[PDB]
Symmetry: D4
Subunit: 173 residues, 8 copies
């Protein structure tokens, strides 16, 4: 879970292109950091503040070599229809980051974010280039407003990998 | 785990006073936010960068109404002896925040941070005034260097509770 | 399963009105016969020949006191968006019979029609006014083309309840 | 069950000849469609309306390349004695289709038609040339009167295999 | 099993009268000794040497206050048809002792005489007026020829209950 | 149990010689019939009527090619001491048939004659030259007085193996 | 096991009197210390060095208020016969301390001294007046020669209860 | 447990040198006898009467070829800090025998001395050169005062291995 590799997955996905494909978490090993996020459902009457805020800050994730992956229990076909629905009609519009489909609910379950065997709870999961979990943000920290905070944690992660931790001055073995 | 209450505990503890007592996570409900952190062991030759950095920033946690709780699998007696050992001799000195004792390893286990049924992995767990988990920081984000980041997440949490999430401008039900 | 009551359910639903509600199979006891049907997913590129054929023959089901219930693993929100998508754009249009939502997949599972813990297989289940299964049609009999056959089975069911079975002429106890 | 092959069996049987043999459901693969039917017991005082009606329509099943298989928990020896009992004395007479014997009750159990670990419930199971279930008719649809309906479903099955389903006119991907 | 009461049962039965009823092993407590016997099947081509030999010696069992109970996995309806079939046509004729029906196979199973979850093995079980097993005869001792031996064991049982065991002359505590 | 081979055993034993050895039930296959008998304990104040009666009739068992095996949960050492105790002092004297020792209670358990995980119940088990159980005599038929009856069953067994069962005169397939 | 009460038992026993009775370990609570010892079997050809050495030192146990209890898997009847066998004939003679009988092997099992579900291993178990285990002596310390050592441990136990442990001179909290 | 080898272990350890290493119980096979002892915790306010008494008698164990091993659930790092704390400040000082670390609590558990999945109970375990348990001393016999008694048991063990047990004079097979 937090000891070694993040739970692996092989899922169906709608790319920025609106073309379908398969995405495995291992595809990003030694290539990109992954910001995997969960949301409950497509097409609801609760505004999709996290998908939109994250997509609005897509270039900030790309500059930091981070692959954004949005995940819900909906099918890839539902994801595509929600992208073909404009924001003015309750849709997400043509977002440019990938939406993965957790139709069997196994992904949500492996990340311990599945609510009453039905929908995923809101969660932000940062995974490093080796496939190791660095953070899990939930509840009042898993909001669209949290984008600025996620990017600061990515900068801290990237800074920590480069320089390591610091020792208290007066401490000695 | 991330759905409702954080795993409950009733543990032995060494207070800032160097006096012993009992601490329950529920003692802080409707009183304080809790920053529960784990570290593997007392008395090792790896500098205690997280205990010291957090204690150096104690006043920043108090101003934000956050109770700092340090936890390892060591006994309260070992915690006390490590506080009575100065930094120059490999100790932590008289830190002013509480060190809880997870002698049965049940706390570490309930937070899924127990490594090979022996020691806890490094972790920072932020819990709100209702006893609900807001974040879990691990691996390269569970360093002493992370203090600035923890406080920014507390400020975001506190800001999010006050104002809620924001909706994309052009989105409509 | 086929001995007494059909598996019970309490599900979310999109009515003919495009209004949301809850539907329990027991709501129809002593009121209506139920033709519960399953299909895999909303929004796919396989034409929805069964939803459309059944809705086109809705008045034939109403005259025979049969409540049509369509079911897939999609949410009620997805069902509503697929109804708000016209046939020319790959939608189902404003169908006048109820679409129930099996978001937890428990309904499909109870009827033994859940394929690889993901989607429901095509199935037509006829249930009497006492809540007892009369038929299960699957595979090459669970097609849109089958509507004429379903109605003939309803007429046979209704005729059998009224008159009972017939005995061979020359047979004697 | 309804996903791939119908439950397989290897049973003792009384043929039209009144000779004994073994019948496996797989014997009919790529040869015949199978109409497997269950009834509770031989020699009862309830007239055998389903065995007799089906045998009276045997030529209609043969013209449609359908093998009729009657099944109860009785032995092949009991089946033979019931065939050697004329209709006027409470028997079935010399029927020309096969009666299989489910002495261990394993067949009934695999088709989920075993009542209180004793006798099979009335059921009509249509199986295609590949050994896949197409329908299950039970309760008020598992009557002798249902013969006309079974044959119409066979005609629909055979028609559906030849031509496939039909798409709604105005629907487009 | 052999410690206290013989396995209890409540079964369907064909009496000497050819009338149907229910028989419980407990009906005979404080009334009769019971000679419960098992055989595999009715209507086979193996002569029913045990049913016939026992019925031919019925008066010898009645004089010794023994109730004869024949048991197989066949239904009461099959038992009745086999009694209505004369010996010359492979039947048992109008036997005057009761044939019980073990349709669920639970009786055979409780006496550990059920062969491959299908038919009962040949067995002679003598039960006393308190419902306690006195003997089990099987294999080459469970033959029709064994009648003379069964009656000698009943005489020994009845003699042993009246007088108890005998002590060796020269033995002393 | 009664289907094929009697439960196998390899036990410690006191022979007629008062010498110790090992006895396996399989040693007698194709050589002797075995009359295995159980009794609760050595050295009690209940006279050993079955050991003594059987030993007094030893020559009758030898003439019929039957190996007598007495069994209790006592050790071979206890068996030997009870044989070295004369009948006048509560012993069995120098009996000439084998006493096997069921120190682990596994033999009694395999024959379903173990009472409250402590001692064996009285039982007479006749086993043929192929190692198959022919009878089990218990309770009021497992007395010392039963010797005459055991020998009559051996004569019937031996007669049945030679000539088989007899068919009723007027019966025909 | 070693935390609170020693495993409880209610066993059959042969007293010094050669009279039979029942012994419960709880009978000695607040009355006597108990030296419970195990040995494999009565009547063997291995001299009973532990029973004899302990009985020869009986008065040393009585002066120290210790109840000696000898235990093996043999019956009380075997124990009595071994006491009625003199030492010159391989017996134990009239020992004056109690021999308990572990016929079900449950006592040996509860003390973890049961060897291959057959006999108890040699063991000396000292139990205090509150029913708490103070020592377990096994293998090369569970010999008849060990009597002097057992009594020294009883003297140490009794001395430790009276005066408690001693603290190192220069040690301070 | 007491049948063959004492539970094996591979543990971290602080040697007399104050250097760290690994200790396996098997390292001492065919070399030394082992006196493995357990105590609950380092750094408590209960004086360490057993560690100190045993270390004060170290030369008596060395002369008898006995390796002293002290064990608690504390880490090797805590053990080292307690040795670097003088007796006057509540420490153990520079003891010259090994302290093993049972950080996972698996050793305590294998010896059945783990109290409430937290700390080990006081116990003295003597193990021979073949790795076989000879004694377990607990409760009021597991005190610092017990050193004189432990050494007398070692002398008895060593004497018993050399000369074996003694037979009662008048006893004969």
């Amino acid at each position: 879970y937090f000891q070694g590799q993040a739970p692996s997955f092989k899922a169906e996905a709608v790319f920025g292109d609106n073309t379908f494909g398969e995405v495995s978490l291992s595809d990003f090993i030694g290539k990109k950091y992954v910001l995997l996020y969960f949301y409950p459902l497509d097409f609801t009457f609760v505004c999709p503040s996290e998908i939109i805020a994250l997509d609005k800050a897509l270039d900030s994730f790309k500059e930091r070599n981070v692959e954004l992956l949005g995940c819900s229990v909906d099918s890839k076909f539902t994801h595509l229809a929600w992208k073909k629905t404009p924001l003015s009609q309750g849709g997400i519009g043509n977002i440019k980051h990938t939406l993965i489909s957790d139709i069997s609910k196994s992904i949500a379950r492996s990340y311990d974010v599945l609510f009453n065997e039905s929908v995923a709870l809101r969660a932000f999961v940062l995974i490093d280039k080796q496939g190791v979990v660095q953070h899990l943000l939930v509840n009042n920290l898993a909001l669209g407003r949290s984008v600025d905070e996620i990017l600061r944690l990515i900068d801290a992660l990237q800074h920590h990998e480069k320089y390591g931790d610091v020792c208290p001055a007066n401490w000695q073995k």
